[PDB]
Amino acid sequence: TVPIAIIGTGIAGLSAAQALTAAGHQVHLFDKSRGSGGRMSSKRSDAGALDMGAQYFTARDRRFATAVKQWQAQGHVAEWTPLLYNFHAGRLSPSPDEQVRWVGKPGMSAITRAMRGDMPVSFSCRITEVFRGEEHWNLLDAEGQNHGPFSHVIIATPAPQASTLLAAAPKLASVVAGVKMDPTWAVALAFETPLQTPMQGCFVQDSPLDWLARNRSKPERDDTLDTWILHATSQWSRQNLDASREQVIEHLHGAFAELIDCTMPAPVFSLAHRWLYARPAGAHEWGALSDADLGIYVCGDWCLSGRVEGAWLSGQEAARRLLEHLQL
Amino acid sequence: TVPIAIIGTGIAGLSAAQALTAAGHQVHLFDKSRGSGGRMSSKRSDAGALDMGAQYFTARDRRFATAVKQWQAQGHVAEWTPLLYNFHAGRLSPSPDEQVRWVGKPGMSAITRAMRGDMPVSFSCRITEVFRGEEHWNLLDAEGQNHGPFSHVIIATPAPQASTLLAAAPKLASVVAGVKMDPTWAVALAFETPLQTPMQGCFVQDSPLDWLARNRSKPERDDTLDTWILHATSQWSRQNLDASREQVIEHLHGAFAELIDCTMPAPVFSLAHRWLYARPAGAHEWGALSDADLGIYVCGDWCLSGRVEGAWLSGQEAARRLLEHLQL
Numbered sequence: 253t254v255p256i257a258i259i260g261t262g263i264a265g266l267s268a269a270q271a272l273t274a275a276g277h278q279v280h281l282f283d284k285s286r287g288s289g290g291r292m293s294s295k296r297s298d299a300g301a302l303d304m305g306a307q308y309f310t311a312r313d314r315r316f317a318t319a320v321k322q323w324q325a326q327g328h329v330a331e332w333t334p335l336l337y338n339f340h341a342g343r344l345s346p347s348p349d350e351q352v353r354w355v356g357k358p359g360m361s362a363i364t365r366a367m368r369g370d371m372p373v374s375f376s377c378r379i380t381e382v383f384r385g386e387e388h389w390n391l392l393d394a395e396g397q398n399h400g401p402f403s404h405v406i407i408a409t410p411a412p413q414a415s416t417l418l419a420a421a422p423k424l425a426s427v428v429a430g431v432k433m434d435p436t437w438a439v440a441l442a443f444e445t446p447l448q449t450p451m452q453g454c455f456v457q458d459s460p461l462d463w464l465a466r467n468r469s470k471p472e473r474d475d476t477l478d479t480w481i482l483h484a485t486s487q488w489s490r491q492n493l494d495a496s497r498e499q500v501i502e503h504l505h506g507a508f509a510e511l512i513d514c515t516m517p518a519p520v521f522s523l524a525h526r527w528l529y530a531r532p533a534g535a536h537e538w539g540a541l542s543d544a545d546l547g548i549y550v551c552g553d554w555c556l557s558g559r560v561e562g563a564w565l566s567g568q569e570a571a572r573r574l575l576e577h578l579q580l
Numbered sequence: 581t582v583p584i585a586i587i588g589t590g591i592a593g594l595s596a597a598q599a600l601t602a603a604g605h606q607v608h609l610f611d612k613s614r615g616s617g618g619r620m621s622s623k624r625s626d627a628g629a630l631d632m633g634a635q636y637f638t639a640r641d642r643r644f645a646t647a648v649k650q651w652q653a654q655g656h657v658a659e660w661t662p663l664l665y666n667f668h669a670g671r672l673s674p675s676p677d678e679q680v681r682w683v684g685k686p687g688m689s690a691i692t693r694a695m696r697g698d699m700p701v702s703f704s705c706r707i708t709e710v711f712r713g714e715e716h717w718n719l720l721d722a723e724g725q726n727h728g729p730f731s732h733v734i735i736a737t738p739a740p741q742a743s744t745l746l747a748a749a750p751k752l753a754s755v756v757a758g759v760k761m762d763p764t765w766a767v768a769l770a771f772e773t774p775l776q777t778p779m780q781g782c783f784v785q786d787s788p789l790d791w792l793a794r795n796r797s798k799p800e801r802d803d804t805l806d807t808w809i810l811h812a813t814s815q816w817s818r819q820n821l822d823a824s825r826e827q828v829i830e831h832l833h834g835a836f837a838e839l840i841d842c843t844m845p846a847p848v849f850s851l852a853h854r855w856l857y858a859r860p861a862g863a864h865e866w867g868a869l870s871d872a873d874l875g876i877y878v879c880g881d882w883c884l885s886g887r888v889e890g891a892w893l894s895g896q897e898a899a900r901r902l903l904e905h906l907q908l
């Protein structure tokens with residue numbers, strides 16, 4: 253049988269995969285990484301899985317909220333209720349606690365790992381070319397290997413990366429190409445001695461740092477080492493896009509220490525990771541993009557809010573349009 | 581000093597490369613392939629180098645012509661005299677004893693190979709990302725390995741492969757993404773026993789074929805085997821894009837036999853190459869695209885005519901602008 257090709261296994265493509273599959277259709281998932289999860293990936297280091305991409309997420313839509321409800325039942329999601337702080341020259345505790353926040357149960361990557369479940373997925377496969385004959389669609393990866401035939405194709409990557417996958421639809425590529433993504437430099441520090449503060453999260457202004465989170469406070473995270481995640485602001489990340497990891501570990505570690513009143517020991521270890529296309533620069537309404545006649549559909553968080561849910565909804569939408577269009 | 585980055589070693593890119601280098605600025609070339617030449621490269625076979633991309637080229641423009649006579653004196657280009665015919669009302673013997681044609685000396689490839697010289701180059705290095713810091717330019721390749729710093733970047737790739745390398749300049753991106761490139765299936769057939777026809781080239785109608793050259797008629801080409809290159813109409817290539825090498829070799833071999841009034845032994849060997857982005861669908865006037873303050877330039881045959889000449893011009897033009905901007 254000729255399945256549907258989904259390029260991208262972050263929550264968007266995995267969302268389309270479920271929709272398509274629940275409606276009884278066959279798909280084949282592709283990703284350039286070793287594994288799935290995209291920007292929701294978790295990293296396993298000396299302190300257990302650290303969450304360095306998506307920090308937590310909310311649910312503002314009934315369907316999405318539903319999905320989350322399920323994942324919770326299955327144990328791949330819990331509620332994060334950290335003591336969040338703020339920064340206006342000094343940490344003051346904000347408490348928008350009326351706001352419910354969700355995280356992967358053992359790690360942010362657990363939601364995508366469960367959504368992937370048993371679907372056929374080709375990993376370490378960077379798709380390069382997407383074309384079609386009268387018949388079907390075909391993918392060419394970086395190794396010149398051909399993949400296909402495929403009935404339709406769903407591009408579920410960050411906009412800039414989607415551009416090269418859309419040469420079959422110039423007009424569509426043209427629009428996708430205008431979507432700007434902001435980068436974000438993330439650093440992770442792990443101390444042997446828990447920092448003496450009750451803080452577990454922090455929205456920061458006037459600092460290279462935009463956000464910080466006490467990773468061990470997240471439900472079910474290994475509590476052996478105190479570990480914090482630092483997220484640089486986009487302007488800083490942009491300005492320091494080419495800086496070395498250690499330099500970034502130097503500066504963001506510096507901004508962090510410069511903002512807590514207490515003492516901060518020598519880190520057992522520190523990691524740095526640059527996300528070139530972290531989140532969309534602006535917000536969008538598309539939901540998803542397409543040329544259904546042609547057979548190619550486009551989705552991702554940047555089609556909407558640039559949040560987990562946006563990404564999730566964008567997938568459902570692309571699937572929804574594919575299914576609808578099958579009435580040829 | 582920080583070298584300029586040129587992505588792509590087709591004539592367009594080595595063209596910019598020559599002008600910049602001749603002016604004193606160091607450059608670094610990159611190409612995902614093993615060797616340079618792009619669409620002008622020659623394929624090695626048991627029949628010796630075969631020209632399966634650009635077949636021949638004319639020099640209309642005066643500067644491009646100047647460059648050609650210099651290459652000829654260098655021994656890398658020579659004139660070609662193909663007895664052309666036409667298949668429309670049965671194959672007649674229609675020719676332009678007019679338009680002077682040129683081909684690279686040992687093989688088409690000789691021209692870019694000579695232009696490359698000992699220029700610093702990184703082969704089998706596919707660039708996937710091109711981003712800017714506060715000062716410099718950096719590139720990431722498919723290995724997730726960095727390259728830099730670079731003072732400027734010149735993208736010299738077929739438009740669709742450039743859209744992703746233009747994330748830092750969404751405005752340019754959007755313009756390049758809108759450019760359509762037409763595919764072209766190529767096939768090479770070597771015959772142990774020379775075909776019984778006196779011709780050496782031919783234009784074609786009402787068939788999937790479109791052009792064909794007797795590769796041995798070109799200057800300094802191996803003699804032993806009588807190799808023929810056959811190019812398929814763009815129209816056909818599109819409908820048979822997802823075709824298999826075998827299917828393609830089959831049909832174009834069929835169509836080629838179904839048009840010569842002679843005896844055709846089965847080939848000793850046969851090759852098929854699918855040039856996805858063979859030629860720009862339409863002509864353009866741009867000359868080159870760019871955002872000089874950002875220090876990012878884009879060039880290629882598709883910025884002009886879509887012929888070798890335009891590629892070489894676009895190359896010179898892109899270099900002209902980067903050099904002019906060096907007025908601070």
Ligand SMILES: Cc1cc2nc3c(=O)[nH]c(=O)nc-3n(C[C@H](O)[C@H](O)[C@H](O)COP(=O)(O)OP(=O)(O)OC[C@H]3O[C@@H](n4cnc5c(N)ncnc54)[C@H](O)[C@@H]3O)c2cc1C
Pocket residue numbers: 259260261262263264265282283284285288289290291292304305306307308309310377378379380408409410413417436438483527529530531551552553554558559560561563
């Ligand atoms: C540092 C950071 C912090 C964030 N914090 C939050 C937050 O706190 N709350 C929130 O709601 N959201 C947050 N986000 C955003 C959220 O992570 C994303 O909106 C969401 O994960 C997007 O999912 P996606 O499917 O659209 O894209 P992704 O999951 O990013 O992409 C899917 C896949 O596309 C693959 N791919 C790309 N190109 C190709 C190719 N050519 N061939 C094959 N595969 C390819 C990639 O490998 C990737 O795995 C954050 C993002 C980052 C980076």
Ligand SMILES: Cc1cc2nc3c(=O)[nH]c(=O)nc-3n(C[C@H](O)[C@H](O)[C@H](O)COP(=O)(O)OP(=O)(O)OC[C@H]3O[C@@H](n4cnc5c(N)ncnc54)[C@H](O)[C@@H]3O)c2cc1C
Pocket residue numbers: 587588589590591592593610611612613616617618619620632633634635636637638705706707708736737738741764766811855857858859879880881882886887888889891
């Ligand atoms: C089948 C065919 C027949 C043709 N016949 C003729 C003819 O008879 N006469 C004529 O005048 N013209 C002809 N042309 C056109 C001519 O070949 C082109 O106009 C010219 O070669 C374009 O050169 P370029 O430098 O602009 O691009 P190219 O030569 O196509 O490409 C340059 C390089 O970009 C590299 N590259 C691409 N993406 C990346 C990346 N992301 N990272 C690193 N490297 C990358 C590629 O590997 C390639 O080596 C023909 C073309 C084709 C394909």
